Amino acid sequence: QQVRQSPQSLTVWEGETAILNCSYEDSTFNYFPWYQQFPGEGPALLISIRSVSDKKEDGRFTIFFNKREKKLSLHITDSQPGDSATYFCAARYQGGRALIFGTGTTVSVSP
Amino acid sequence: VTLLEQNPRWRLVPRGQAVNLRCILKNSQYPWMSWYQQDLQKQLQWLFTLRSPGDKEVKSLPGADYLATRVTDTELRLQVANMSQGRTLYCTCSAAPDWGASAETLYFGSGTRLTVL
Amino acid sequence: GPHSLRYFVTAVSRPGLGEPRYMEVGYVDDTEFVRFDSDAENPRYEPRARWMEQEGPEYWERETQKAKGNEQSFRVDLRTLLGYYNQSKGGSHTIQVISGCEVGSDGRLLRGYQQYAYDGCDYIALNEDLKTWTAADMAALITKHKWEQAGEAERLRAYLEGTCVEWLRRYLKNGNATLLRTDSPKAHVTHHSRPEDKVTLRCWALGFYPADITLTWQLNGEELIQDMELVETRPAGDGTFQKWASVVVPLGKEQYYTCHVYHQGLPEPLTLRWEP
Amino acid sequence: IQKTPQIQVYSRHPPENGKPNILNCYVTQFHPPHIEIQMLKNGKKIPKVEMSDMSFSKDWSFYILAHTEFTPTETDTYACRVKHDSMAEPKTVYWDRDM
Amino acid sequence: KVITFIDL
Ligand SMILES: *[C@@H]1O[C@H](CO)[C@@H](O[C@@H]2O[C@H](CO)[C@@H](O[C@@H]3O[C@H](CO[C@H]4O[C@H](CO)[C@@H](O)[C@H](O)[C@@H]4O[C@@H]4O[C@H](CO)[C@@H](O[C@@H]5O[C@H](CO)[C@H](O)[C@H](O[C@]6(C(=O)O)C[C@H](O)[C@@H](NC(C)=O)[C@H]([C@H](O)[C@H](O)CO)O6)[C@H]5O)[C@H](O)[C@H]4NC(C)=O)[C@@H](O)[C@H](O[C@@H]4O[C@H](CO)[C@@H](O)[C@H](O)[C@@H]4O)[C@@H]3O)[C@H](O)[C@H]2NC(C)=O)[C@H](O)[C@H]1NC(C)=O
Ligand SMILES: *[C@@H]1O[C@H](CO)[C@@H](O)[C@H](O)[C@H]1NC(C)=O
């Protein structure tokens, strides 16, 4: 209930831009990491952003942060056969013991 | 990778019995040890974060009852009883509660997959 | 002007007398605004300034939870150092920290603090580059090396630029009114008779705030830098401070001397004289 | 490194026989933090003594402020006795109406 | 808000 993303499923043609949303309710959350999970092994960090920023770019991924609206999004620009996996949006607050995870968004990029 | 050593990697559980997972901390610079579970529909969820020996906490959830204990400065234990359904458990370690190990964020291994019966 | 958020942490080990004593105390621009003491029952994070009561019940649960973690952290630290210095497990020792930030009026981060001290002496602190550490002795090199491994500096830098700077802004927003209060000093001179043909002239400054003040005696144009007695500013115990400067002078010749009180809250420095 | 404690015994307001005041005892510059602080009236220990919460300063030395209500008279004597590891033996400081 | 402290 603290973090929740959408849509839970998404398909896109290779070379195309996939777009995953995410939103949260604790305005105290200062860190938002995005994890990429391939069926088989644990979640692995893909890209993260600090509440003090509003844009984070690395390779083909981009986090958009709107501290005002408590909403972020990841843009998988120029998708690909491989970028296909489940994507979690997490968040936490300074001094907090837990890392809150969004409900995940499975992505399939078909050539 | 390789701060923890969690075993086994896959496991079967007779629905009447409980299981006992164990996590061995390799590097001690990251004392804080936790337990996360990913249920069958893929939802990750923090269970515990223990720091010192003697610490024990019980938390119950849809699908499993838990008992985590910090046995020593390198061994974090988790026993899962009444496990009604499947879940995959992950052990992590960090410098401080709100930070990764030597990195800003928490690192997840292959975890231990638990399939009923 | 500049402002700062700093925390004074203490962990003192008491042999046999139970676990160690742990405290955290926050200051906004040198004013205590919060405090966590592991001794009072229901050890919790308490506000120390009426303006902090605007914090949700969630702020204090969280801060208390975090403090209890830090506490476990220092019980370890205490034992560890007993190791580095090779000191029997029987003693009573002290670990202190000063963590915080100071940001100018331009919003820029002037200074970020992370200093540790063992048993009253410097141990290890973060340099001004917020990138490297300075070890006080051979022991502190062990810590320095571990912290460089783990990238503790990057961790602190992240804290200083996010959480520290961000909540300093908030605390200031809620505290503005209260923090900038300024009570000007009320001053007077008292006459006391010393042995033979001599007397002591004492200049008193009372009920002022902030504590910063300067008192000087003048023998016609010049300042008695030499023979002037003066106490360390002390609290009245009600929010204000006191202080006085006294000078020994020739009986009857008291009029040759004048007291001067310089305080930021005064529209202009005060001029004082012994009034019969 | 144990710094020698500084003591100041004074009153909240200018003293006046008969007129109730607050007698303060300001101890500073000490380490370790454990310290025994007493306030006396004509040689006996005053029971009603409130101490500030301990605090330390920039140079790691602690400081504490003890106090207690009192109403000065011409004859009564008041002092603050401090016990601290750094000192061979106790230190007493009498309240001086002029200081 | 006080930072969280690691180990010496
Ligand atoms: C993932 O998230 C995204 C973003 O939230 C979702 O996409 C949005 O979904 C909404 C909800 O359905 C869409 O709104 C619908 O719009 C239609 C009409 O379409 C619009 O375009 C036509 C073009 O011709 C135009 O004519 C219409 O007027 C519509 O314009 C829309 O106008 C909106 C307000 O006037 C405006 O919405 C936002 O308002 C907020 C105010 O709080 C901010 O100003 C937003 O600003 C930005 C920003 O932060 O800078 C603008 C950025 O460009 C944008 N980034 C991106 C991705 O481009 C950001 C981000 O979205 C946020 O930061 C994320 O947190 O927002 C401002 O966008 C829209 O911008 C604008 N549409 C566009 C795209 O230009 C309407 O018919 C319909 O409303 C009905 O109106 C009736 C009126 O009587 C009313 O009675 C009835 O009840 C209906 O409400 C509806 O609002 C929206 O178009 C769409 N936007 C985008 C960018 O796609 C996805 O659905 C999510 N996906 C999933 C899987 O969930
Ligand atoms: C298992 O479930 C039973 C209820 O069926 C409960 O009474 C028991 O305490 C549980 N065991 C534990 C400790 O998890």
Q: Where are the domains of chain A?
A: 1-111
Residue C167 per-residue DSSP state? H
Q: Is A50 in the pocket of ligand 1 (CB under 6 A)?
A: no
Q: Which residues pair with C230 in a beta bridge?
A: C245
Q: How many B-C residue pairs are in contact by the CB < 8 A criterion?
A: 27
Residues B78, B68: Cα–Cα separation, whole Å? 4
Q: Which residues pair with D44 in a beta bridge?
A: D41
Among chain E residues, CA nearest to B100: E6
- Does the domain spanning B1-117 belong to CATH 2.60.40.10? yes
Q: How many CA atoms lie within 13 A of C25 on its CB side?
A: 19
Taking an 8 Å cut-off on Cβ atoms, the answer to whether B31 and E7 are in contact is: yes
Chains B and E touch (3+ CB pairs under 8 A): yes
CA distances from C20 to C10, C87, C209 (A): 10, 16, 35
Same domain, C152 and C177: yes
Beta-carbon contacts of C68 under 8 Å, excluding residues fewer than 6 positions away, are: C43
Q: Burial letters for B17-36: b for 16+ Cβ neighbours within 10 Å, e otherwise?
A: eebebbbebeeebbbbbbbb
| D1-99: CATH class | mainly beta
Q: Is A81 in the pocket of ligand 1 (CB under 6 A)?
A: no
Residues C34, C124: Cα–Cα separation, whole Å? 25
Which atom of ligand 2 lies at the shortest distance from residue B81's CA? 14
Taking an 8 Å cut-off on Cβ atoms, the answer to whether B105 and A33 are in contact is: yes
Region of C17 (left: φ > 0; alpha: ψ -120 to 50; beta: rest) is alpha
Probe target for ligand 2 pocket from B61, B65, B67, with the most ligand atoms within 8 Å of CB = B65
Residue set of the binding site of E for GTP: 7-8
Coil, strand or helix: which one is C57? helix
Task: Select from C165, C181, C197 the last residue of a domain.
Answer: C181
Domain spans, chain B: 1-117
Beta-carbon contacts of C20 under 8 Å, excluding residues fewer than 6 positions away, are: C11, C12, C13, C14, C74, C75, C78
The answer to whether the beta carbons of residues C144 and E8 sit under 8 Å apart is no
The residue segments making up the domain with residue C67 are 1-181
- Contacts with C153 from chain E: Cβ below 8 Å: none
Residues C236, C213: Cα–Cα separation, whole Å? 14
Same domain, C82 and C6: yes
The answer to whether the beta carbons of residues C28 and C175 sit under 8 Å apart is yes
Among chain A residues, CA nearest to C164: A94
Same domain, C159 and C205: no
Distance of residue C159 Cα from the nearest chain A Cα, in angstroms:
9
β-pairing, A9-13 vs A105-110, is: parallel
Among chain C residues, CA nearest to E8: C143
Mutation for B interface: E4, E5, E8, most B CBs within 10 A? E4
Residues B91, A90: Cα–Cα separation, whole Å? 17
SS3 content of chain C, % helix, strand, coil (to 5): 30, 40, 30
CA distances from E2 to A39, A52, C11, D71, D84 (A): 39, 18, 15, 42, 31
For the domain A1-111, what is the CATH superfamily, name and number? Immunoglobulins (2.60.40.10)
Chains B and A touch (3+ CB pairs under 8 A): yes
Could you list the beta-strand ranges (E) of C119-185. 121-126, 133-135
Residue E5 per-residue DSSP state? P
- Contacts with C62 from chain A: Cβ below 8 Å: 93, 95-96
Neighbours of B95 (CB within 10 A): 23
- Contacts with A97 from chain C: Cβ below 8 Å: 65, 69
The answer to whether the beta carbons of residues A32 and A95 sit under 8 Å apart is no
Taking an 8 Å cut-off on Cβ atoms, the answer to whether A52 and C161 are in contact is: yes
Which atom of ligand 1 lies at the shortest distance from residue A72's CA? 65
Q: How many C-E residue pairs are in contact by the CB < 8 A criterion?
A: 50
Among chain E residues, CA nearest to C98: E2
Q: Is A66 in the pocket of ligand 1 (CB under 6 A)?
A: yes
CB < 8 Å from C in window 2-31 of B: 29-31
- Contacts with E1 from chain A: Cβ below 8 Å: 94-95
Q: How many C-D residue pairs are in contact by the CB < 8 A criterion?
A: 63
Name chain D's partners: 3 or more CB pairs within 8 A: C
- Contacts with E7 from chain B: Cβ below 8 Å: 29, 31
Q: Is C51 on the interface with E (CB under 8 A)?
A: no
Residues A93, A100: Cα–Cα separation, whole Å? 9
Among chain B residues, CA nearest to C75: B52
Residues C112, C40: Cα–Cα separation, whole Å? 30
Q: Is B82 in the pocket of ligand 2 (CB under 6 A)?
A: yes
Could you list the beta-strand ranges (E) of A1-111. 3-6, 9-13, 18-24, 29-37, 44-50, 55-58, 61-66, 71-76, 85-93, 100-101, 105-110
Residue C161 per-residue DSSP state? I
Beta-carbon contacts of C72 under 8 Å, excluding residues fewer than 6 positions away, are: B51, B52
Total count of domains within chain C: 2
Distance of residue C126 Cα from the nearest chain E Cα, in angstroms:
13
Taking an 8 Å cut-off on Cβ atoms, the answer to whether C65 and A95 are in contact is: yes
Residues C246, C215: Cα–Cα separation, whole Å? 10
CA-based end-to-end distance of chain B: 31
Tallying the residues shown for chain D, one arrives at 99
Q: Is B71 in the pocket of ligand 2 (CB under 6 A)?
A: no
Instruction: List the one residue out of A32, A10, A7 whose CA is nearest residue A83.
Output: A10
Taking an 8 Å cut-off on Cβ atoms, the answer to whether C163 and A30 are in contact is: yes
Q: A73-76: long-range contacts at Cβ-Cβ below 8 A with a sequence spacing of 24 or more?
A: A73/A19, A73/A20, A73/A21, A73/A22, A74/A19, A74/A20, A74/A22, A74/A34, A74/A46, A74/A47, A75/A17, A75/A18, A75/A19, A76/A12, A76/A17, A76/A18, A76/A19, A76/A20, A76/A107
The answer to whether the beta carbons of residues D23 and D78 sit under 8 Å apart is yes
Beta-carbon contacts of A13 under 8 Å, excluding residues fewer than 6 positions away, are: A79, A109, A110, A111
CA pseudo-torsion sign C168, C169, C174, C179: positive
Helices (H) and strands (E) in chain C, counts: 4, 17
List the structure tokens of C265: 């809250």
Ligand having the closest approach to the CA of B80: 2
Beta-carbon contacts of A69 under 8 Å, excluding residues fewer than 6 positions away, are: A23
The answer to whether the beta carbons of residues A80 and A55 sit under 8 Å apart is no
Q: Is D3 on the interface with C (CB under 8 A)?
A: yes
For helices C139-150 and C57-84, the axis angle rounded to 10 degrees is 130
The angstrom resolution of this structure is 2.7
Residues B36, B81: Cα–Cα separation, whole Å? 16
The answer to whether the beta carbons of residues B26 and B3 sit under 8 Å apart is yes
Task: Select from C147, C181, C215 the last residue of a domain.
Answer: C181
Measured in whole angstroms, the distance separating CA A61 from the mean position of its chain's CA atoms is 9
Taking an 8 Å cut-off on Cβ atoms, the answer to whether D99 and C121 are in contact is: no
Distance of residue B79 Cα from the nearest chain A Cα, in angstroms:
20
The answer to whether the beta carbons of residues B37 and B44 sit under 8 Å apart is yes
- Shortest-distance Cα residue to atom 6 of ligand 2: B82
Task: Select from C181, C206, C229 the last residue of a domain.
Answer: C181
Instruction: List the one residue out of C140, C143, C179 whose CA is nearest residue C48.
Output: C179
